[PDB]
Write a protein that binds this ligand. Structure first.
Ligand code: CA
Ligand code: CA
Ligand code: NA
Ligand code: NA
Ligand code: SR
Ligand code: SR
Lengths: 301, 301
C-alpha cells in the first residue's frame, strides 16, 4: 500500500482519525532541503529557507542536492495520493530548512540559526512551528547549539534528533552525537522491522525512544522513491508522531499543552522491547498503546 | 494484611524490590503535622517544622491537633512492622511541615512558606527533599503561592496536590482548588476501590491522575487507625509512588532525571478507565504498568 511498514508498526493509522492526521501542525525539517515539486510532498510544503552557501548564499533556494532531506520529509508527511508513500502525519505541513549541503555536511552555526529561524519564524496568519526535526549529528558539543536548543524547548517547541549511527551492538558501549546528546531534545535511535536493535545506533544515557530506521522506503529525488537506513530515518517517525499526539491530546485535555506535557504523551506511547534504557530509551514508538491499555468498547453506528 | 487495599490496587508491592521501597527519598508532608510517636511512623520521620501559630508560634512543635496529617503520612510511608498499615513507600523518609491548624485550615501564606521551607531545606548530610505533598485546597488563586510552586518545580521538586472535594458527578462541570489548579503541580483526584469516580472529586482541565480516595484505612492519632475519605487520601499514594518511580527510573536510566522526566515516568504508570481527561487526567495510578506492557520472561533462580 501507499503506506510503508515503518508508518505501520509505529501504528500511525490507528490514530489518524482522532488526530486529524496532523492537520494544523507545522513541522520544521532541518536537513539538505527538499525536492519542492515531488508529487508526494508539494501540498505539504508551505515554505522554507536556505542557510547554506550552497547555490552561493542564496537564501531562498532550498531544493535538495543530496536526496536525504527529501527522504526524511516523506517519512514525516508524504501525503496520501494513491501514489508511493504516506508519512506518519500526511496532513501536517512542512517548513524546509536546508542547513546541510549536497555533501550532507553542515557547520555547527548553520544548525544553530536553523533552530532559531524556525522558533522565531511566523507565516501569513501567525501560523508558527511546534515540532522541529534534525536527522543529523556532530561529535562536538558547542554551547549555543545547546542554547538554540534550550531556546526552542522553552518556547514550546519540540526538538527531535537522530541519535547517531556511530555504535556497535553493545548496549553498554556508549557513543554520543549532538544535538541528540543534549537532554532537552528528543533523541531517537533505530531498530529494524523485527525490533532487532540496528547495529549502528548510538547508545547513551540520553536516548528517549526508538523507531524504524532500517531500509525505510520514502520519497526520493527526481520524484523517486528509495530505501535508506540510519537513525536519520527513525527520527522523522517520532517527528510526525508528535503532530498526531499534540492534536489528539489537545482534543482530550481541551487546552494547550506544554513541552513537558507533550513529551509525557509521547513517552506513554512507547513500549519497551527487552533492551536497556541506554539503548531503547523509553521503548519503541507504539502510537495506539494508550487506547489498547484502556480498552473501552463502544457502539459501532 | 499490614497492606491496605489502596497501596495494593496502585500496585506498589509489584515494584518495591526494584525501587528499594522508596529508600533514600525524603517526602515533605504539608498538613496538620503528625503524631511523631506513632509506632507505624517514628523511624520514617526524620524531622519537621511548625509554621502555624498553633502552640503559639512554636516553630518546633509539629504534632497533630487534627489527625489528618497523621493519616496522609501513613499512606505515604507507614512502615512494615507486622502492625497496622504500610505506605506506598515504607522506606522513604518524611519531613513534617505543619501548616494547617487543629481546625484544618491554613492561611495562604502558611502554605507558601511551607513549600519554600522544604525546597530550601537541607539536613545533616545535605540530604534534600524531592517530593512534596499537600492534601489541602483553597478556592483562591494568590500569585506567589503560584511562585512558591514554580520555585519548587524548577529546583527539581515534585509537587503533589489533592484536587479538591467540591464537585458533583459530572465530568463536565469543572470545579477548581489551589494549588492543584496550577499546571506545574501534580493534581490528584479520587476514585473508590471499584474505580468508580467518587462524587466529591473536582474535575477540570488541570487534573493529572487519580488514585484511591474513598475509605482509606491509615495511621490515626493516639497510635490509632482510621478510614478517611477525600482527594486528600488520593494525593499521598501518588506522593509515595514518586519515591518508588525516582529510584526505579534512576536505576534504569543510570543518571539523575529532571522534574519533566519524573512526570513522564509517573504518567506512563497511569491507566485510563473510561472517564474524560478532565476527570481522570491521564488515568488511574498503576505502578506495574510498564513491566506488564514489556513482558520479558526471565529465569527464576
Ligand atoms: Ca553502544
Ligand atoms: Ca464536575
Ligand atoms: Na502518497
Ligand atoms: Na506497619
Ligand atoms: Sr531527552
Ligand atoms: Sr499538572
Amino acid at each position: 500500500s501507499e503506506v510503508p511498514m515503518g508508518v505501520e508498526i509505529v501504528e500511525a493509522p490507528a490514530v489518524w482519525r482522532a488526530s486529524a492526521k496532523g492537520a494544523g501542525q507545522i513541522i520544521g525539517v532541518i536537513d539538505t532541503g527538499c525536492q519542492v515539486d515531488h508529487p508526494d510532498l508539494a501540498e505539504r510544503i508551505i515554505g522554507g529557507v536556505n542557510l547554506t552557501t550552497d547555490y552561493g548564499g542564496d537564501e531562498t533556494n532550498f531544493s535538495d542536492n543530496n536526496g536525504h532531506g527529501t527522504h526524511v520529509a516523506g517519512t514525516v508527511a508524504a501525503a496520501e495520493t494513491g501514489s508511493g508513500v504516506v508519512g506518519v502525519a500526511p496532513k501536517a505541513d512542512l517548513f524546509i530548512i536546508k542547513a546541510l549541503s549536497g555533501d550532507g555536511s553542515g557547520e555547527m552555526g548553520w544548525i544553530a540559526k536553523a533552530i532559531r529561524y524556525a522558533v522565531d519564524w511566523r507565516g501569513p496568519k501567525g501560523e508558527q512551528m511546534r515540532i522541529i526535526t534534525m536527522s543529523l549529528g556532530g561529535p562536538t558539543d558547542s554551547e549555543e547549539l545547546h542554547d538554540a536548543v534550550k531556546y526552542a524547548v522553552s518556547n514550546n517547541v519540540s526538538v527531535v534528533c537522530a541519535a547517531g549511527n556511530e555504535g556497535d551492538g553493545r548496549e553498554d558501549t556508549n557513543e554520543f552525537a549532538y544535538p541528540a546528546a543534549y537532554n532537552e531534545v528528543i533523541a531517537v535511535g533505530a531498530v529494524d522491522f523485527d525490533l532487532r536493535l540496528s547495529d549502528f545506533t548510538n547508545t547513551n544515557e540520553e536516548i528517549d525512544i526508538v523507531a524504524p530506521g532500517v531500509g525505510i522506503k520514502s520519497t526520493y529525488l527526481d520524484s523517486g522513491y528509495a530505501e535508506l537506513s540510519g537513525t536519520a530515518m527513525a527520527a522523522p517517525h517520532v517527528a510526525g508522531a508528535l503532530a498526531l499526539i499534540i492534536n489528539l491530546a489537545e482534543d482530550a485535555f481541551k487546552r494547550s499543552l506544554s513541552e513537558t506535557e507533550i513529551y509525557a504523551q509521547l513517552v506513554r506511547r512507547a513500549t519497551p522491547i527487552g533492551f536497556t534504557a541506554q539503548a531503547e530509551g523509553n521503548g519503541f514508538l507504539t502510537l495506539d498503546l494508550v487506547e489498547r491499555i484502556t480498552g473501552q468498547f463502544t457502539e459501532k453506528g
